[PDB]
Amino acid sequence: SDLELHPPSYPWSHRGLLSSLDHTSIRRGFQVYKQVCASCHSMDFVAYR
Amino acid sequence: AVSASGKWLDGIRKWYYNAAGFNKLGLMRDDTIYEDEDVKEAIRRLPENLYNDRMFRIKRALDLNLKHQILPKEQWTKYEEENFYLEPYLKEVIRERKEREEWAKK
Amino acid sequence: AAATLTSKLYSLLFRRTSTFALTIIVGVMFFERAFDQGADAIYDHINEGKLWKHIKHKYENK
Amino acid sequence: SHTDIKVPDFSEYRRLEVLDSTKSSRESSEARKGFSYLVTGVTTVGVAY
Amino acid sequence: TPMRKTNPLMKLINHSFIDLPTPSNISAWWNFGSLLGACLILQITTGLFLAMHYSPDASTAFSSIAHITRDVNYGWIIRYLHANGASMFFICLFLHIGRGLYYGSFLYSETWNIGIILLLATMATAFMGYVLPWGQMSFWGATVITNLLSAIPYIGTDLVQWIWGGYSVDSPTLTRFFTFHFILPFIIAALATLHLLFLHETGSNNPLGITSHSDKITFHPYYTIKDALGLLLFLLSLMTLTLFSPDLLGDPDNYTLANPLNTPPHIKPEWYFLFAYTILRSVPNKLGGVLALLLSILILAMIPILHMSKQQSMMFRPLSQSLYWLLAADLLILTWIGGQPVSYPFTIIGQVASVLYFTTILILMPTISLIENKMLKW
Amino acid sequence: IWGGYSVDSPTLTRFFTFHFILPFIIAALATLHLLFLHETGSNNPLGITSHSDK
Amino acid sequence: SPDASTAFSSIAHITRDVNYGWIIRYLHANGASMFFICLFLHIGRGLYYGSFLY
Amino acid sequence: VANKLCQSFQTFSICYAETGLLGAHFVCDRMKIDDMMFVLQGQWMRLCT
Amino acid sequence: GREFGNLTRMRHVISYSLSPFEQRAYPHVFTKGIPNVLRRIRESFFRVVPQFVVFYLIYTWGTEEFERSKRKNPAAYENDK
Amino acid sequence: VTRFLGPRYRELVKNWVPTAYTWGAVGAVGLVWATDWRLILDWVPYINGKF
Amino acid sequence: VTRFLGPRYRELVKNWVPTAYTWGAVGAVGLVWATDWRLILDWVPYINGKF
Amino acid sequence: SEAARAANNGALPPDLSYIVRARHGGEDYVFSLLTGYCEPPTGVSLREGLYFNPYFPGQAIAMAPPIYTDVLEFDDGTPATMSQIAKDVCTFLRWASEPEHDHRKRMGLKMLMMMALLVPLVYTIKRHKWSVLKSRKLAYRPPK
Numbered sequence A: 001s002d003l004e005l006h007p008p009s010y011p012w013s014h015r016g017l018l019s020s021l022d023h024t025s026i027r028r029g030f031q032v033y034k035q036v037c038a039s040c041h042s043m044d045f046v047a048y049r
Numbered sequence B: 001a002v003s004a005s006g007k008w009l010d011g012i013r014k015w016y017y018n019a020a021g022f023n024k025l026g027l028m029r030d031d032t033i034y035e036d037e038d039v040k041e042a043i044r045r046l047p048e049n050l051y052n053d054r055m056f057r058i059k060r061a062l063d064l065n066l067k068h069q070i071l072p073k074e075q076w077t078k079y080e081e082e083n084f085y086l087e088p089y090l091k092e093v094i095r096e097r098k099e100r101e102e103w104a105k106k
Numbered sequence C: 001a002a003a004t005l006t007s008k009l010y011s012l013l014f015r016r017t018s019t020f021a022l023t024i025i026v027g028v029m030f031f032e033r034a035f036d037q038g039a040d041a042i043y044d045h046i047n048e049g050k051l052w053k054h055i056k057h058k059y060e061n062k
Numbered sequence D: 001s002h003t004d005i006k007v008p009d010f011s012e013y014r015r016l017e018v019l020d021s022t023k024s025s026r027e028s029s030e031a032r033k034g035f036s037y038l039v040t041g042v043t044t045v046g047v048a049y
Numbered sequence E: 001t002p003m004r005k006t007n008p009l010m011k012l013i014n015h016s017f018i019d020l021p022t023p024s025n026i027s028a029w030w031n032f033g034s035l036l037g038a039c040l041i042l043q044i045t046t047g048l049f050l051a052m053h054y055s056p057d058a059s060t061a062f063s064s065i066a067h068i069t070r071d072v073n074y075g076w077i078i079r080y081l082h083a084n085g086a087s088m089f090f091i092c093l094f095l096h097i098g099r100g101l102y103y104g105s106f107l108y109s110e111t112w113n114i115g116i117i118l119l120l121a122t123m124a125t126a127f128m129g130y131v132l133p134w135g136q137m138s139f140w141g142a143t144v145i146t147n148l149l150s151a152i153p154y155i156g157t158d159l160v161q162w163i164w165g166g167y168s169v170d171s172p173t174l175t176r177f178f179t180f181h182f183i184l185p186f187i188i189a190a191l192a193t194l195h196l197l198f199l200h201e202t203g204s205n206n207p208l209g210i211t212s213h214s215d216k217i218t219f220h221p222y223y224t225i226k227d228a229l230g231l232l233l234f235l236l237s238l239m240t241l242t243l244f245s246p247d248l249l250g251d252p253d254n255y256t257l258a259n260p261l262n263t264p265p266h267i268k269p270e271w272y273f274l275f276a277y278t279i280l281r282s283v284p285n286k287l288g289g290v291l292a293l294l295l296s297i298l299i300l301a302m303i304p305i306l307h308m309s310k311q312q313s314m315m316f317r318p319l320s321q322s323l324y325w326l327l328a329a330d331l332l333i334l335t336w337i338g339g340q341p342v343s344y345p346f347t348i349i350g351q352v353a354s355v356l357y358f359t360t361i362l363i364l365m366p367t368i369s370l371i372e373n374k375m376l377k378w
Numbered sequence F: 001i002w003g004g005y006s007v008d009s010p011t012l013t014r015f016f017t018f019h020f021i022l023p024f025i026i027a028a029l030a031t032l033h034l035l036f037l038h039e040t041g042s043n044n045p046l047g048i049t050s051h052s053d054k
Numbered sequence G: 001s002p003d004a005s006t007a008f009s010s011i012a013h014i015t016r017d018v019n020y021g022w023i024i025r026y027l028h029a030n031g032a033s034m035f036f037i038c039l040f041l042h043i044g045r046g047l048y049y050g051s052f053l054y
Numbered sequence H: 001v002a003n004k005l006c007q008s009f010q011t012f013s014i015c016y017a018e019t020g021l022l023g024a025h026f027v028c029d030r031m032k033i034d035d036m037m038f039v040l041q042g043q044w045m046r047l048c049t
Numbered sequence I: 001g002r003e004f005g006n007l008t009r010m011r012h013v014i015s016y017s018l019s020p021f022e023q024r025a026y027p028h029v030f031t032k033g034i035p036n037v038l039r040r041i042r043e044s045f046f047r048v049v050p051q052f053v054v055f056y057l058i059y060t061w062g063t064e065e066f067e068r069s070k071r072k073n074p075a076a077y078e079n080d081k
Numbered sequence J, K: 001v002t003r004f005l006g007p008r009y010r011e012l013v014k015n016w017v018p019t020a021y022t023w024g025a026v027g028a029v030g031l032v033w034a035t036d037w038r039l040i041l042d043w044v045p046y047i048n049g050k051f
Numbered sequence L: 001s002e003a004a005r006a007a008n009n010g011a012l013p014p015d016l017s018y019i020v021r022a023r024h025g026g027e028d029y030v031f032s033l034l035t036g037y038c039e040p041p042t043g044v045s046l047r048e049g050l051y052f053n054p055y056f057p058g059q060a061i062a063m064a065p066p067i068y069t070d071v072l073e074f075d076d077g078t079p080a081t082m083s084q085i086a087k088d089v090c091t092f093l094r095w096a097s098e099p100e101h102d103h104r105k106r107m108g109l110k111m112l113m114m115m116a117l118l119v120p121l122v123y124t125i126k127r128h129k130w131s132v133l134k135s136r137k138l139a140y141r142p143p144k
């Protein structure tokens, strides 16, 4: 019935107009994905390329 | 048929007259009227000097509109200044059309 | 009295339209490379350490 | 009449170089034209890129 | 004896472009019309390169777009230029129609009507094209829109199934929509040629509303660079919408696969349709909502009949101008209401906004026009 | 043209699009065709000008 | 359906499961050959009657 | 005279101690004023090369 | 039949002009341009803005009303019990 | 065809040849730049965007 | 709009009435045949190849 | 998907390839989803397989709390705080959902500079072509 709580805005590193993703966080985050996530979740459209 | 309230009508007509922007461009009231075929024939019947004054004031208006400027305040058309030149002719033309139509429906 | 640099730029080039097109294309020939490395140097300048091309050193070439 | 007409002053709009009624325009003309042709020439470069 | 006057192709180009007289005092608003002419090209060219990878099967329509946005080189820019490009197309379109409504350009009734038909064509094109991506909002929007056809009293469901190609929305419907979406824009182009055809034997209108025969000027020297600047600003705003904030005019959920089973919450159609959608939300009856919907766009045809003032442009008639901006504010109201879930505050404001939307231009405008007539003593 | 090292699905889609688009160009060029034709008039089998009996 | 796999099966779908589809496919495929008959004859008369002077 | 353009005209050079005026002078039918120009300037261009 | 020679008759309206090269692209901008844009905007104000302000009012009131009914709904359960 | 031969035609072609050098240079340099030909471009003092 | 009503316009509309009903019959029967409308076609004496 | 539901109390784990762009608020929704796991408020209860995450629209997500401190050890050797982990996850998902992000920002930078250069020039050209009309005078001279 009651609507879900609205998420807070965060100061993400890449939120800026010229800001870009930090690739190390992508690396470590993929390292999290490889087993903590991949045990049940999938990514149909992403390859090892 | 109101008296002093009619003077009030003259007042609101004057204010609305200043609300319309053609005074800013020097135009007479009759320049602004939409030119359908009745108005076309009405303009065709105009005396040459008057027709020339009309065409020139229209060019002055379009030229001011070009550069998005405004006619100087001293030169603005005044509410009492106007001469309603096109009315008699346009009324003759429209009355002739109404006559031809009333004949045509019979 | 002395010719303006714009004039020396003019009569030597602009008066004939084909030379004008020619200097236009050569100007594009330099401007492409200049604008390229310039804007890339800027975009590199905003986020040093974020882009992987400079992150390569932690793991590259054995 | 055929002589009564005269051109209204345009000095307010004129380029600064040619404002006086003394110096010859024949030398300045290459500069005046050269500036604008330089402008169009840069713009063509941008559009081409 | 210039060659333009000799060769027939150079003759027609000498007419439509290089030499035809235009009022000198034409402003920035008329430029939008030409911009529409530009947008269509983009929507073709860009779109033409999306059709080379897109697969209109229901089982692969989504993955193919993933193939475009990812696997294809420079595919994502084409994707976003296309999607945002439709939005810019309808923005220039709305501004164009507003321009035609404001300056009394509707008096060219044939051109007006061709504009209306072309409007309906662009609407159907945008709809079927939005159905193509085959996301959640795409599939659901198709089901909801299609059912409206079911509204028609006798033929109804047979006709609706005739659109679906089946009981329910599925792959054949997607393929059909891909075909019509492919074919319609060129018909929109031929209509546009008719549009300019009717337009040019009278000439373009000017903001003052007075005839400009005294001050006609060739199109090539001036309006080509004026429209070059307008096209440049158009590409500027479009590229800024695409390369910085691609998503905000769009709607998340489309990136999810369509589920015939599961049903998405907010279920909001893409923004240019929203106001019309509110009208469906406004009338409790089905067929009544459908007729109110068709009236929402047809209503434009009745405007010349409803004209009462002895002048064209609103600029000399401030009261009607105020009604006009009331109308624009009202359209903003509906357009905002279309983004919202039904609740007490919204339903009441939507109904009042719709009724006001009909009454302001079927009643108030002609009457205040007559008042403006009496105030000026003729 | 192939979109790859051999004929395959992307090529088939290429040809589906181009084959879908060309005829509509052919119609416009046909309008140009008649446009260059009608300002001179149709030819007759004798080859003699036939303005006398149009 | 323009894919390397589904195209041929879609053709069988047109020839069979689709109503009157085979008539469409054959009026189309033979209509092209008719288009070239009419086209070759159309060029041939131009080569004959000297319509090429236009 | 070919499709009957200019009615009558002449070329002139009214030189002065300080400047001068090269040019042309022609009568026109209302409908031909453009065409009569297109030839004239072209002739100048034809002499420019 | 609406070529420039075919257009409206008009008589002794003399007009003066200048070559683009003879005059600068931005005359009197600071002195004449900005005040002109200002009188234009000043003419535009009351005819345009306030109705949009009314849109802002109906917008904020509708948002506050929906948000009010929604979160006071449990509060409506509170006064209920 | 035969009529085009003639001394004034020779004078005219000689008058228009340099313009042909110019447009030929325009088309040549423009063609190379557009396709970014590696073989011709490298020879240049500064344009080395290609690796 | 008021002008269209009148003493002769009544006569004219009356002159075109038979044509109006006749073309109305044209549109009606033409619609019934183009659509294969079943309802009226069940009633027609011979056109009953429908089952 | 059927086996996935059978393995997960009927719930189907969503594909993560578009999970950032799919949900409202983007990656911002995901981090907040991975963080909040307050124990349920008094006066409400739920199925034993369900877990109370307020940010989830159903407010009773079937997902078990995926992460906590030292679930994992980064090869980088940085500490495995659950906040750091969730941040890295949302970042990698953000990339998985928008691979073209960097190149897009680059072109965007190039285009702004490009348009910033082009606009004054083309507008100046328009001022140039139109100046003859903007400056032109006209007068009216009746014969008498």
Ligand SMILES: CCCCCCCCCCCCCCCCC[C@@H](O)O[C@H](CO[C@H](O)CCCCCCCCCCCCCCC)COP(=O)(O)OCC[N+](C)(C)C
Pocket (backbone or CB within 6 Å): C014, C015, C016, C017, C018, C020, C021, C022, C024, C025, D037, D040, D043, D044, D047, E038, E041, E042, E228, E229, E231, E232, J030, L122
């Ligand atoms: C999305 C659909 C639309 C397409 C997008 C269009 C985007 C364009 C918007 C930008 C505006 C561009 C207009 C700017 C002006 C153009 C330059 C033009 O004015 O140059 C004129 C003349 O043009 C050049 O001189 C000739 C061409 C030079 C450059 C040629 C480069 C190659 C272009 C070939 C393209 C052919 C198309 C096919 C593709 C190969 C100069 O005339 P002018 O200033 O008054 O007098 C000069 C006097 N001179 C010459 C004696 C000095």
Ligand code: HEC
Pocket (backbone or CB within 6 Å): A036, A037, A040, A041, L008, L011, L012, L013, L014, L016, L019, L023, L030, L033, L034, L056, L058, L060, L061, L062, L063, L064, L065, L066, L067, L089, L090
């Ligand atoms: C198998 C245990 C499990 C693990 C571990 C897990 N997920 Fe989930 N996740 C689920 C299930 C099941 C759902 C669906 C919840 C529902 O339908 O109510 C879900 C939902 C989500 C959602 C929200 C989807 C929605 O509809 O709101 C996101 C985002 C997500 N997962 C991503 C992640 C991220 C990031 C992690 C961090 C490693 C993660 N998953 C780990 C099982 C898991």
Ligand code: HEM
Pocket (backbone or CB within 6 Å): E039, E040, E043, E044, E045, E047, E048, E049, E050, E051, E054, E065, E068, E079, E082, E083, E085, E086, E087, E089, E122, E125, E126, E129, E130, E132, E133, E181, E182, E185, E186, E188
């Ligand atoms: C006025 C003309 C057109 C308009 C306004 C228009 C608009 C749209 C819109 C709104 C979408 C939805 C995309 C999205 O939201 O992600 C779309 C998609 C698409 N358009 Fe167009 N379109 C037009 C013409 C064309 C043309 C001529 C083609 C020719 C190929 C085309 C091909 C496509 C294709 C294949 C898609 C789906 C592919 C994808 O979305 O990735 N469109 N178009």
Ligand code: HEM
Pocket (backbone or CB within 6 Å): E029, E030, E031, E032, E033, E034, E035, E036, E037, E038, E040, E093, E096, E097, E100, E105, E106, E108, E111, E112, E115, E116, E118, E119, E192, E195, E196, E199, E203, E204, E205, E206, E300
């Ligand atoms: C893709 C869509 C359209 C295109 C390409 C197009 C094209 C054009 C063009 C090129 C002009 C020349 C004048 C100008 O640009 O201002 C014009 C004028 C006009 N258009 Fe459109 N048009 C489109 C849609 C519409 C619509 C939807 C309407 C009406 C609802 C409309 C009504 C008019 C009218 C009345 C004019 C006359 C302008 C005047 O009188 O000054 N057009 N159109």
Ligand code: HEM
Pocket (backbone or CB within 6 Å): F026, F030, F033, F037, F041, F042, F043, F044, G039, G042, G043, G046, G051, G052, G054
């Ligand atoms: C889609 C393809 C074509 C279409 C729609 C088309 C259409 C037409 C039409 C309708 C005519 C009028 C005279 C007639 O019908 O005989 C005509 C004349 C002509 N066409 Fe075609 N044609 C096509 C292809 C061609 C080809 C391939 C050629 C030459 C190789 C050609 C050259 C000519 C010539 C020379 C005439 C002049 C005939 C005369 O003056 O009597 N056309 N065309």
